[PDB]
Design a binder for these strands. Structure first.
Length: 187
RNA sequence: AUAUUUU
């Protein structure tokens, strides 16, 4: 049972580390604004408004507990424990031609998921194919899931491996997997 | 409707 508490805390850490991570932060208008207010610090009162974290827990003490154990050590907790921020010692990487070129080469296109599949279904299916840093579910202008996604792996090596494996299926349904740039070339 | 939500 104590195991479940560890699991919840590992998920809380992962979710918050995603919001403040290299992939999401540079594209997060709302969050980039909060960060400019009090030297990076964002009150837990605000953090609780984040749906995904909300679903995990809205309790400040749990969140702080979870973060204080994080292995990533990306986040910093204030003394009064009412706010958190990305460590000033882990600044965002400079987005150079090279950085972007590397990102594109680590991005994959996958088609074949059912329209009702959720980010959680997809995340679970992916925890066995390499370290994923971002999952983008492709939706219509009105937010309807198209069944296709873009995935960004931790490195071009893990992405290459994944794209190389031919017999992949989701809940025993065939899947079309290509490198993201290759997908655009065809389309 | 910045009432932005993997905010």
């Amino acid at each position: 049972d104590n195991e479940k508490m560890a699991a919840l805390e590992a998920k809380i850490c992962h979710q918050i580390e995603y919001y403040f991570g290299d992939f999401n932060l540079p594209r997060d208008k709302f969050l980039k604004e909060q960060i400019k207010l009090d030297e990076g610090w964002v009150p837990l009162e605000i953090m609780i408004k984040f749906n995904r974290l909300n679903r995990l827990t809205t309790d400040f003490n749990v969140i702080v507990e979870a973060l204080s154990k994080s292995k990533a050590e990306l986040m910093e907790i204030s003394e009064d424990k009412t706010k958190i921020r990305r460590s000033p010692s882990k600044p965002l990487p400079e987005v150079t031609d090279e950085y972007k070129n590397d990102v594109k080469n680590r991005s994959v296109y996958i088609k074949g998921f059912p329209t009702d599949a959720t980010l959680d279904d997809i995340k679970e299916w992916l925890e066995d194919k390499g370290q994923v840093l971002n999952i983008q579910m492709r939706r219509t202008l009105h937010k309807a899931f198209k069944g296709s996604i873009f995935v960004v792996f931790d490195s071009i090596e893990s992405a290459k491996k994944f794209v190389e494996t031919p017999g992949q299926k989701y809940k025993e349904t065939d899947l079309l997997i290509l490198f993201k740039d290759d997908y655009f070339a065809k389309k």
